[PDB]
Amino acid sequence: NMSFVKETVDKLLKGYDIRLRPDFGGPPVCVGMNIDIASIDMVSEVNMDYTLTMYFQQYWRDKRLAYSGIPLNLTLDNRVADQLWVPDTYFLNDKKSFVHGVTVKNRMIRLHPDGTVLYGLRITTTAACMMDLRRYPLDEQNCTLEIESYGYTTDDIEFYWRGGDKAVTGVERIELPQFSIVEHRLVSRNVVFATGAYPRLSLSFRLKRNIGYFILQTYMPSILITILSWVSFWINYDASAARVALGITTVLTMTTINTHLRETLPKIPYVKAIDMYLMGCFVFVFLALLEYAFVNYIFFSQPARAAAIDRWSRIVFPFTFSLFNLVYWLYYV
Amino acid sequence: NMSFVKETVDKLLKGYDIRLRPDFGGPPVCVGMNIDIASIDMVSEVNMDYTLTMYFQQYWRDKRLAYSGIPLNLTLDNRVADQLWVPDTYFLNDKKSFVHGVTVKNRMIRLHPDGTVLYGLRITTTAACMMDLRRYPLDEQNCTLEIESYGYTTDDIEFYWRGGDKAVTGVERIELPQFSIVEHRLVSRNVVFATGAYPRLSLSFRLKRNIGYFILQTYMPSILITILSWVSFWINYDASAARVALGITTVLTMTTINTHLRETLPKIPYVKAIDMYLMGCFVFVFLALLEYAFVNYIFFSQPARAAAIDRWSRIVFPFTFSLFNLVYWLYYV
Amino acid sequence: DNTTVFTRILDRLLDGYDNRLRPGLGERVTEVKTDIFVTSFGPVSDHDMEYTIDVFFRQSWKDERLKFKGPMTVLRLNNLMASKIWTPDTFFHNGKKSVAHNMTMPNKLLRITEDGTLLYTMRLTVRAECPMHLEDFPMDAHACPLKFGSYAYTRAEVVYEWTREPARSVVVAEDGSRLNQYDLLGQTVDSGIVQSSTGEYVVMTTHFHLKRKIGYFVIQTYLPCIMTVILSQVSFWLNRESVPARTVFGVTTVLTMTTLSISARNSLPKVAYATAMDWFIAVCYAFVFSALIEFATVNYFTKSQPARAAKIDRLSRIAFPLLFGIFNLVYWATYLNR
Amino acid sequence: DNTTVFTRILDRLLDGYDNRLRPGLGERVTEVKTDIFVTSFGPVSDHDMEYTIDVFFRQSWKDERLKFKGPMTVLRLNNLMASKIWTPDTFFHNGKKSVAHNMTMPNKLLRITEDGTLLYTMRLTVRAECPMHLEDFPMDAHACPLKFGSYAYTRAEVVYEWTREPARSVVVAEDGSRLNQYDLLGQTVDSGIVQSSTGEYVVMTTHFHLKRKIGYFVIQTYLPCIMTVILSQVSFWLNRESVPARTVFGVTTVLTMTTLSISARNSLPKVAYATAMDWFIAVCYAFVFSALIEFATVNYFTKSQPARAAKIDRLSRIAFPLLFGIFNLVYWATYLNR
Amino acid sequence: QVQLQESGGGLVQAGGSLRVSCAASGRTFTTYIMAWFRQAPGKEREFLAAMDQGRIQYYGDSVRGRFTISRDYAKNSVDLQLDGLRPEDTAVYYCAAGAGFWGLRTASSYHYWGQGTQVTVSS
Amino acid sequence: GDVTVILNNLLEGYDNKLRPDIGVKPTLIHTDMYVNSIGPVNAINMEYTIDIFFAQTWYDRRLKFNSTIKVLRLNSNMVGKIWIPDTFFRNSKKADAHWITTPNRMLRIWNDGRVLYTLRLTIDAECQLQLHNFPMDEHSCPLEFSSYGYPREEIVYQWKRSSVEVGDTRSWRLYQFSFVGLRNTTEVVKTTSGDYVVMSVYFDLSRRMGYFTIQTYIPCTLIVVLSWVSFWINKDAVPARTSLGITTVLTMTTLSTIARKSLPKVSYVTAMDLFVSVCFIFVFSALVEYGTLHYFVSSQPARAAKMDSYARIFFPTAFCLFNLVYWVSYLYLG
Ligand SMILES: *[C@@H]1O[C@H](CO)[C@@H](O[C@@H]2O[C@H](CO)[C@@H](O[C@@H]3O[C@H](CO[C@H]4O[C@H](CO[C@H]5O[C@H](CO)[C@@H](O)[C@H](O)[C@@H]5O[C@H]5O[C@H](CO)[C@@H](O)[C@H](O)[C@@H]5O)[C@@H](O)[C@H](O[C@H]5O[C@H](CO)[C@@H](O)[C@H](O)[C@@H]5O)[C@@H]4O)[C@@H](O)[C@H](O[C@H]4O[C@H](CO)[C@@H](O)[C@H](O)[C@@H]4O[C@@H]4O[C@H](CO)[C@@H](O)[C@H](O)[C@@H]4O[C@@H]4O[C@H](CO)[C@@H](O)[C@H](O)[C@@H]4O)[C@@H]3O)[C@H](O)[C@H]2NC(C)=O)[C@H](O)[C@H]1NC(C)=O
Ligand SMILES: *[C@@H]1O[C@H](CO)[C@@H](O[C@@H]2O[C@H](CO)[C@@H](O[C@@H]3O[C@H](CO[C@H]4O[C@H](CO)[C@@H](O)[C@H](O[C@H]5O[C@H](CO)[C@@H](O)[C@H](O)[C@@H]5O)[C@@H]4O)[C@@H](O)[C@H](O[C@H]4O[C@H](CO)[C@@H](O)[C@H](O)[C@@H]4O)[C@@H]3O)[C@H](O)[C@H]2NC(C)=O)[C@H](O)[C@H]1NC(C)=O
Ligand SMILES: *[C@@H]1O[C@H](CO)[C@@H](O[C@@H]2O[C@H](CO)[C@@H](O)[C@H](O)[C@H]2NC(C)=O)[C@H](O)[C@H]1NC(C)=O
Ligand SMILES: *[C@@H]1O[C@H](CO)[C@@H](O[C@@H]2O[C@H](CO)[C@@H](O)[C@H](O)[C@H]2NC(C)=O)[C@H](O)[C@H]1NC(C)=O
Structure with missing residues (x-):
């Protein structure tokens, strides 16, 4: 039974091209996003940034990875991620970010029989947000995180929040020594650059400082x-x-x-x-x-x-x- | 001439198993170590650590690499170290260390006709020592450096200082702005962990603060x-x-x-x-x-x-x- | 020929072997036995609410695909070979930024037994989160956790267990403690279940119980404040006519x-509430404030009602030391017994 | 259906392809079109004489070795094919340690058109040196350069050009300013040639003009010094018998x-010359020094010429504020205009 | 003041669901461990379940697979779903909050305690 | 075209683990250095920062070819394919190469087999500074490099015609120091693994004194006067003279406060600490002089009158003698 799985997986990865997006040259591939916030800390006024730790999940369908005969979802070793196509997602306001790698790289790949791919990462990022401190310390701040695709356009890839307003969880469990999170918001829009349009998702929080x-x-x-x-x-x-x-x-x-x-x-x-x-x-x-x-x-x-x-x-x-x-x-x- | 050396080297590395230590399954391989200290700096009382830069050399014998016909000691490019077995030496009390890489990786591999291997590395490390400050600023500190094999026991590898008490050089050329090095000492013992006995070499200094x-x-x-x-x-x-x-x-x-x-x-x-x-x-x-x-x-x-x-x-x-x-x-x- | 025989077995084990699949996939749950050796419990940072720990992480599991027959019964493996087989993807849930040491070589070890058992050990430094309640600062005690589990495999695929009794599965070295400001009392070991948006996972947990040392705050905050209060009540024994002396003294x-109050907050993290030191300082400040108000009252009533001014000074010479000693008795009996 | 044809095209381009050789090797001079989009003009560090900038770097060039025929006239690829072709080895001459972002993927894009024109885009965080002349601090203006070119190819092999008119070839976002203490007045775009021991190279230059904001130093430094001078001149209105009061005022x-002088000079970079704030503090120091000398003179002529001492105090109550006001008027009129 | 008020409870006919709740007031327990305990008549106080800030669930070795704990962090509350109840489950259920010093499974490490809620199982 | 054929034939039968002329003669390497800028000097850590272009030239018989092309100008793609010397800097605490947007390396090959290899480096090098004569100190900060593995019998370095070049010396980041000049040498150093050729460059730096003269020496002289x-x-014993x-x-x-902020926290006494301390002793003794005179006012005619006349004569003389010894010692003797 394990040899049949080994054969099926090697069959799928045989002839697979990493340089081509799913449905390349045809309809755009739709990518759903989930964020599971684990902790927010170090809101720095001097550096004008904040540190965020989260689980970042992406869901998309690739017909080239569809398999039959196994009634299971295949969670594979994360090094198989180097053998597949993944979206070129990036954060526009990120100053410094990394993926945790202890004891191994904090990455996940999961496959489904219909060809849906789940791709998870555990990311710590430092994001820059401008603070208007004219009313300091009796001030409110609005800090955001911008998610965009670096290379593809709306003719190739599309972004949406998976689950509506429930796509982001864990904010209600956050405790900040100096601030208190008042609200969070999800915005979907496109950005018209010089090279064309770009899908973007935005997650924003509003902070009210303690006195x-x-x-x-x-x-x-x-x-x-x-x-x-x-x-x-x-x-x-x-x-x-x-x-x-x-x-x-x-x-x-x-x-x-x-x-x-x-x-x-x-x-x-x-x-x-x-x-x-x-x-x-x-x-x-x-x-x-x-x-x-x-x-x-x-x-x-x-x-x-x-x-x-x-x-x-x-x-x-x-x-x-x-x-x-x-x-x-x-x-x- | 050159083609003969290239033939001999390609012969040595052909059918070489890098996963096997020398004399695998038999008597332990003896490893001799030398240290040449270049500088000591940043003896931090706040962080309770110190910084050390040194030339670390190891000396062992591998009969799989013995060659004849060339009356020379072959110094090879350091990338050949990736194709050879080297000891899994590590420093127990190390917090942060790296190997210098300008203009290339500061690494040396030298072969001898009898099969002996000399392996050199230029290492800057930050080592932690416990400090007793009840007599501060009239105190005297003892800071060590532990050397151990991570995954071999005394059945497979042994450590010794190459040169007796001359194994460590460069102590007399260290000028600390605040301390003076009264003495240094070399110890050799086997640490009994759960997985078995592990060889260990220890080098310690005794610092006397200037008043x-x-x-x-x-x-x-x-x-x-x-x-x-x-x-x-x-x-x-x-x-x-x-x-x-x-x-x-x-x-x-x-x-x-x-x-x-x-x-x-x-x-x-x-x-x-x-x-x-x-x-x-x-x-x-x-x-x-x-x-x-x-x-x-x-x-x-x-x-x-x-x-x-x-x-x-x-x-x-x-x-x-x-x-x-x-x-x-x-x-x- | 022993080396060639061993090489053949090594080159034969991995034939038809896929490291992208866990052992028993589709047949059984992979059981992982884990134990931890702590070589040094590093510094604790109250500002960032985090701590550092250096550990040997030992994992053990069974893989039938790696059985062998040979002269030996235990095999010790180079770290290049340990990357060719499937290993668990263990991660720390509350870790902030951890380091796996590879000086001078990767600090990993993989041993294979004849029956197919794999032992996998590594050396790690972990910086983890320890949220703290500082209402009793600097007479507070904390439980700093350490949680770990599988990032990708749910509890229907991979489960974790301790190698021995949970008390004896985490062992700290005798010289492990590297704490200038805390006292490590002990640890408790447990295991639970968490649910995320991707499934249910097994979590292995350890809690280290710390109690803060107070001598530093005694020499930095409490003693100077007590000496300042004693000096302010010393001011009551100077004669009334020495107006500039008592005014300079009080101010x-x-x-x-x-x-001192402004100095003390630098050590403290930016917390919303008031610690025990904030209350001690506020009371000492109110005592010296009332001593200067008392002198303002005596100077106001001097030269018109000298009898009343003398009675006020005589009663203040008794009331202030008594009230301050009573406050200290209550303060150091309410908090030192928690 | 279509993907097979696209991959066969992709598997055909690199047949007999050498990325070690530039396009038009030995037939023409490679031309590169360059443009920059500044997402955020980051902080400027006065202590290190350097600044940060986050940009999108776009390069366009023609490679006749990559012509293709197919329904898709434009092909956009992420990073595997872009690492198998020839790209310009652009580097920043004055650039210090810079970062190429890798989250969650390499921020690189390569597009190919049917005729063989390639477009290469990347996201970078450039940290570059900005030499400063701080003689007019904190009322100084600077022009920070950004110079880049080819490291290994001389001007006979690779030449750089702007994609559009040079002014329109560098674009800054309206929200892309992250300057606490600076105002971005504008930019100048230039091109030129540099001569070295290895040959002549084409260099593309951009200058950003900055003017420092002074209200922070006015409210934090200038006002306290002016107020301390006013306090020092308050002493002239106290009676001459009050020796301790005037002595305490002076000291x-x-x-x-x-x-104030130590605080003000502990934030500037250690430059071995005086700035405008150094002169302002020196003059305030000389004014309070002369005020204390004036008191030494008044106390000297008391009990011998009380009329002269009173006349000195009366005239100093007029001369000191007038001289300080004239000094301030000259200082601010001199420096604000320049 | 800080009060842990408990609801639910009552009597059940040797089975069925029974969701016992616990609402906190006077202090936000986001950074604390919120647990549930059980005290049979006159025997002893027994640990049942606990959930920390990271949503890690701990259970006693007797109630694993039958009782489910949860927390509503927004409303600062905690619930316990009792399923497959047995006559031995008739006791007084308590709600507790604490920092878990010297052990989250020990009752002597919780600062705040509820007023209790009788759960009776009839067979 | 044929350039690919040339590269393929050059790399055919090539072993990059072996240096050229491994069993015949030592490999001779010619080195050049262009200094872009010398960054700030860190007296606290005893280090300095330098940014350079580093060039090396040598002969490789294995890389000869015949064609109408005289030189093959290449980027870093071939650096890892040929033999490169393992040059390192002996007194470097932390050094790195530049990788934006591509590795900053260039490689040129001539038809006679000569190879030119260049790269850009930023180095933090150690320089032990003696601050005994501060602010009248002079320093020579070295930069030494050699081969890590090859002894003198295998690799020999040699300076070219133009060894070290400097461009805009006025654009560097030296505020405290001024650049005087440079020297380059050659030496053989014996280690535990053999004898190695070490090439060194020394940069001479002198501190400027206009700031410390106008900030400390002149104000202190005017207060003493x-x-x-x-x-x-x-002699009046007046409140004014006491004030x-x-x-x-x-x-x-x-002034003493602003005296002890322009220096690192060295634990030896500098010339500035000595000057400020002697000025403090002079004003301290002038106040002890007044305390004695005030007590002496009734007893003054018998002894204090001549005591004050002698102090009026001795003090300017002793201060001129002190200044003479100080400036002689620190300008002509140390
Ligand atoms: C302990 O563990 C740590 C890790 O935790 C470990 O550190 C890592 O060590 C490995 C080596 O073991 C390092 O990997 C090497 O890095 C070399 C360059 O190092 C610099 O750049 C690093 C980042 O690399 C990116 O960028 C470079 C270009 O600048 C690029 O070449 C890389 O591929 C890579 O690009 C990826 O990412 C970018 C985005 O960032 C993408 O845009 C891109 O698409 C791609 O995905 C950087 O991390 C380094 O900084 C570290 O080190 C410095 C000191 O050096 C230190 O100061 C820093 O603090 C930091 O620690 C540094 O800036 C790179 O050249 C190596 O690549 C070689 O070798 C590999 C392996 O053989 C090979 O696959 C490559 O092709 C290449 O071969 C050569 O390269 C030559 C380069 O000139 C070239 O001339 C040759 O031609 C050949 O190239 C090929 O040739 C063939 C044949 O001709 C041709 O067909 C090909 O097309 C091609 O031209 C190698 O990647 C890793 O960087 C270290 N990471 C860190 C964080 O330190 C440590 O060593 C361990 N210690 C021990 C004792 O075990
Ligand atoms: C912190 O600060 C940031 C920045 O200010 C805040 O982010 C902003 O949040 C608000 C509220 O969510 C956003 O407004 C919403 O925008 C969406 C997206 O509109 C885009 O996509 C539409 C298609 O889906 C498209 O039609 C839009 O184009 C039209 O509108 C724009 C408006 O400028 C106009 O220029 C065009 O010409 C078009 O007319 C656009 O491309 C939009 O869908 C939302 O509409 C809601 O409200 C309307 C009624 O007003 C209702 O009819 C809709 O059904 C819907 O309910 C809404 O306009 C804003 O875009 C965000 N800004 C950015 C830069 O992203 C953030 O909220 C702050 N934080 C906190 C905590 O508040
Ligand atoms: C190659 O290395 C060996 C080992 O270091 C050298 O042999 C040493 O030679 C010296 C000088 O005669 C002796 O004092 C040592 O005792 C020798 N070592 C051993 C282990 O016997 C040898 O000389 C080197 N060869 C060359 C050409 O340098
Ligand atoms: C750096 O080294 C070069 C090379 O040795 C020195 O140049 C030599 O100078 C001497 C005279 O001092 C001449 O006789 C040689 O012909 C020169 N060699 C050349 C030009 O290749 C140079 O002087 C050194 N720089 C110093 C010492 O500052």
């Missing part, structure tokens, strides 16, 4: 330093060294925060929301130290007016800072 | 800050701002130094000599500030007692600090 | 706490 | 300027 |  990390790591320290800068208003105005040291050391601490954020965040040369919040806090502590500059400048000739300015500053600064927070959070949430 | 960089970079700043913390003992106790600023800025500087060096060096969550010294200096400056807190607390009712405490701190602190340094630089050196 | 202990 | 502004 | 200006103001002293200390500390 808890920035709340506990970024905004709270700046808020606390701003509130602490108001402690000067409750100190007597003749303590010049204490109030000057408090004002300028809080300014230096805010500068240190901003500089180290500049060191760690991606170089994005336009104004983000975090830069607006940090600059607003820096302005509040800058004006608090300029207020003490005025008080120190006038506390000798008019000590009562300087005391009234400090007393009114004890009210004006927290109220204007809460008004700034209210305007900031309304415009971004 | 001059750390004297200037680590210990001296801590010593000078600790001495500067004693300046406050000669200042009048009614100058509270000066002695408080000096004490708290020396405390902040000592904390910054200790935590930066902890963050820069690899994470080894146990107490090292650098940590014991930095903690001793942090304790001394902490007690100096607590001494000023006591003096400022008692200087109103008992000025004479406060001045006596300052005089005794001016005596006790340098003497206790020198005794601490003597204990430190004796318990480790 | 520099506050800036030191802010610096 | 904290000096430390802030030092930190 | 201003602090000696401070010595005739000290001047401490501010000059702050300026010197700022």
